Enzyme design. Structure first.
Site, PDB file in Angstrom:
ATOM      1  N   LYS A  20       0.863  -1.175   0.000  1.00 25.69           N
ATOM      2  CA  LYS A  20       0.000   0.000   0.000  1.00 25.69           C
ATOM      3  C   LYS A  20       0.900   1.225   0.000  1.00 25.69           C
ATOM      4  O   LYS A  20       1.658   1.441   0.951  1.00 25.69           O
ATOM      5  CB  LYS A  20      -0.938  -0.011   1.205  1.00 25.69           C
ATOM      6  N   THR A  23      -2.708   6.772  -0.075  1.00 22.84           N
ATOM      7  CA  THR A  23      -3.901   6.906   0.740  1.00 22.84           C
ATOM      8  C   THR A  23      -4.773   7.986   0.117  1.00 22.84           C
ATOM      9  O   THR A  23      -4.268   8.951  -0.469  1.00 22.84           O
ATOM     10  CB  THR A  23      -3.560   7.213   2.216  1.00 22.84           C
ATOM     11  N   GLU A  73      -3.376   0.696  -3.601  1.00 24.25           N
ATOM     12  CA  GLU A  73      -4.032   0.459  -2.325  1.00 24.25           C
ATOM     13  C   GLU A  73      -3.976  -1.007  -1.911  1.00 24.25           C
ATOM     14  O   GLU A  73      -4.436  -1.343  -0.821  1.00 24.25           O
ATOM     15  CB  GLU A  73      -5.505   0.893  -2.408  1.00 24.25           C
TER      16      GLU A  73
END
Ligand SMILES: [Ca+2]
Length: 102
Positions: A20, A23, A73
Site C-alpha cells: 500500500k 492513501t 491500495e
C-alpha cells in the site's frame, strides 16, 4: 514525537511491506505535499509504526478513481469504492497522497 497522520491498523502490514503506497483522504488531510516526511501511527492506539516520505499528491473524484489507484491500495477497484463509501459517505472530492515507507 507526535504522529502527523494515522491509518487503520488493518493497513499497517500492507504499508510496511510496501503493498500500500497511496492513501485517499478528504479535505481534512489535503495539506500533505511532496517532500513531507511524516510520522505515521495507528488510528486505534496511536502506536507509531513508520515514517513515510510523500512522493506525489493529486486531486481525485469518486468517478475518476482508477484501477491503478486500487492497485496502489492493494485493492481491487470495486473494493476501493466500497472502502470509500464507508469511510467518506456521500463525499466525491478527495486527495491522493503517494508515499514510501522510510
Ligand atoms: Ca462495506
Amino acid at each position: 514525537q507526535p504522529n502527523d497522520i494515522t491509518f487503520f491498523q488493518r493497513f499497517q502490514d500492507d504499508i510496511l511491506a510496501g503493498r500500500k503506497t497511496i492513501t485517499i483522504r478528504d479535505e481534512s488531510e489535503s495539506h500533505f505535499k511532496t517532500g513531507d516526511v511524516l510520522r505515521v501511527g495507528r488510528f486505534e492506539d496511536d502506536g507509531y509504526f513508520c515514517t513515510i516520505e510523500v512522493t506525489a499528491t493529486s486531486t481525485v473524484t469518486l468517478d475518476t478513481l482508477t484501477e491503478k489507484h486500487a492497485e496502489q491500495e492493494n485493492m481491487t477497484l470495486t473494493e476501493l469504492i466500497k472502502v470509500i463509501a464507508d469511510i467518506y459517505p456521500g463525499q466525491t472530492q478527495f486527495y491522493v497522497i503517494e508515499f514510501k515507507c522510510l
